Design a protein around this ligand. Structure first.
Ligand code: HEM
Ligand SMILES: C=C1C[C@@]23CC[C@H]4[C@@](C)(CCC[C@@]4(C)C(=O)O)[C@@H]2CC[C@@H]1C3
Length: 414
């Protein structure tokens, strides 16, 4: 069972050796649960692009058949009504309600806050590091920047997002096939607390609307529940919150760790916009924040791939991280090399193969530009501010079945 392999402590630090074995010996892998896992870049790309007809989100019947605990799991039923589980026209309706605030144009208008938050945070980080303290950069920068920026966009107070960060982490870990009974229970319970917060937040924004995404969603719902039902509203709030910062923080963590691990590639962070972006794309390819997606893709046909046949109705997952290191798509895949993404469109290598960390197709990440811009603003500043930064020991990873997140990124000045 590949999902238990990826969650095993042995493979927590570097799971790519197992992923390499999986691509070569079982690329269309059937787990013990009957869930399939695609590890080759070309198959992952096809599955993502084919979502719509060949693959769809689960119906009511699929949900009961594949997730028998669904009637009992608050987290699973909240997921079932997010737009990531839907196809057009429903998917098109939901996405258009939220896409404006994530466009290039609107993300640009956040750059002053990103700079301000970055400079304010670093000024305090510098003060502590010049005394010779050790700083958990994950805790005091990597999570803080996207939490604050997301809260501003979404309509949450900074106090709210910090109060809920622990609930978010707990919810996220229950969203994978290897989740233990305890993790699933804890996830459902935290989803309840998050849902109660949003009930309070909805009434506040109903009575006090601002230029934030939650206010737009609530007014849309209040005006016409066929544009956004009560079920779709609460799943959207819960879902966007889940996706709003945890993976961005992990990207920042990975970027800092790559900065310190490969001093030769650090020069890319000192160049023009294109050179900085190229570094960030290679961070995303080299170690995706989500190894695979919690989102099920249900086969609408028997799908024969080589000698393996995926039966109709089967849940299929995509190992984004493995496709990112597939030598058929990225030569010398274990080399960290920003030149792959220099001068090209975002996510596209100079040889025409895409990174997969943001997905592809109808469910391509809504927040990709928001994530990329935050790191493009702060990473060159970190690099210039602290040239003598080093690790003060091994980073402590958040043990996860599928997310590549950290509990600590301990640094100090040399
Ligand atoms: C580096 C940071 C991020 C990564 C690696 C990431 C990853 C992903 C992936 C892999 C998917 C597709 C999942 C699938 O197709 O099964 C996705 C979709 C999505 N992401 Fe991102 N995400 C990031 C940041 C964000 C942020 C900051 C937001 C802010 C709202 C966000 C919102 C969404 C939404 C709404 C979708 C669903 C889009 C749709 O179904 O049409 N993500 N993300
Ligand atoms: C509104 C939503 C935002 C979304 C983005 C993708 C994200 C999840 C699924 C949470 C787990 C990690 C990750 C990266 C994944 O796909 O596994 C999240 C919750 C539900 C939907 C999709």
């Amino acid at each position: 069972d590949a999902f238990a392999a990826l969650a095993a402590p042995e493979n927590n630090s570097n799971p790519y050796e197992y992923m390499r074995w999986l691509r070569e010996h079982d690329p269309v892998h059937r787990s013990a649960s009957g869930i399939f896992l695609l590890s080759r870049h070309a198959d992952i790309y096809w599955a993502l692009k084919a979502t719509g007809d060949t693959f769809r989100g689960p119906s009511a019947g699929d949900l009961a058949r594949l997730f028998p605990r669904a009637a009992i799991s608050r987290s699973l039923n909240l997921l079932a009504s997010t737009l990531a589980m839907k196809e057009p026209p429903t998917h098109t309706r939901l996405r258009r309600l939220i896409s404006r605030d994530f466009t290039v144009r609107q993300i640009d208008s956040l750059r002053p806050s990103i700079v301000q938050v970055t400079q304010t945070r670093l000024g305090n980080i510098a003060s502590s590091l010049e005394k010779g303290h050790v700083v958990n950069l994950h805790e005091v920068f990597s999570v803080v920047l996207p939490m604050l920026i997301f809260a501003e966009l979404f309509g949450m107070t900074q106090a709210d997002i910090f109060e809920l960060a622990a609930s978010i982490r707990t919810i996220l870990e229950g969203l994978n096939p290897h989740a233990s009974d305890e993790q699933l229970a804890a996830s459902d319970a935290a989803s309840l607390e998050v849902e109660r917060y949003f009930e309070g937040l909805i009434e506040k924004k109903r009575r006090e609307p601002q230029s934030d995404l939650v206010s737009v969603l609530v007014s849309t719902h209040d005006d016409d529940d066929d544009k956004l039902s009560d079920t779709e509203l609460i799943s959207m709030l819960w879902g966007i919150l889940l996706g709003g910062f945890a993976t961005t923080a992990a990207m920042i963590d990975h970027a800092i760790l790559d900065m310190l691990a490969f001093p030769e590639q650090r020069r890319w962070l000192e160049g023009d916009a294109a050179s900085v972006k190229a570094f960030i794309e290679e961070v995303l390819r080299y170690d995706a924040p989500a190894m695979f997606s919690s989102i099920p893709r249900i086969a609408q046909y028997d799908i024969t791939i080589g000698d393996v046949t995926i039966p109709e109705g089967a849940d299929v997952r995509v190992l984004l991280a493995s496709g990112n290191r597939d030598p058929a798509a990225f030569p010398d895949p274990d080399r960290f090399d920003p030149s792959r993404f220099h001068g090209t469109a975002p996510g596209m290598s100079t040889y025409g193969h895409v990174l997969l960390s943001f997905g592809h197709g109808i469910h391509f990440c809504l927040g990709a530009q928001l994530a990329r811009v935050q790191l493009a603003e702060c990473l060159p500043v970190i690099n210039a501010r602290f040239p003598h930064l080093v690790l003060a020991g091994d980073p402590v990873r958040e043990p996860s079945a599928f997310l590549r997140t950290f509990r600590s990124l301990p640094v100090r000045l040399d």
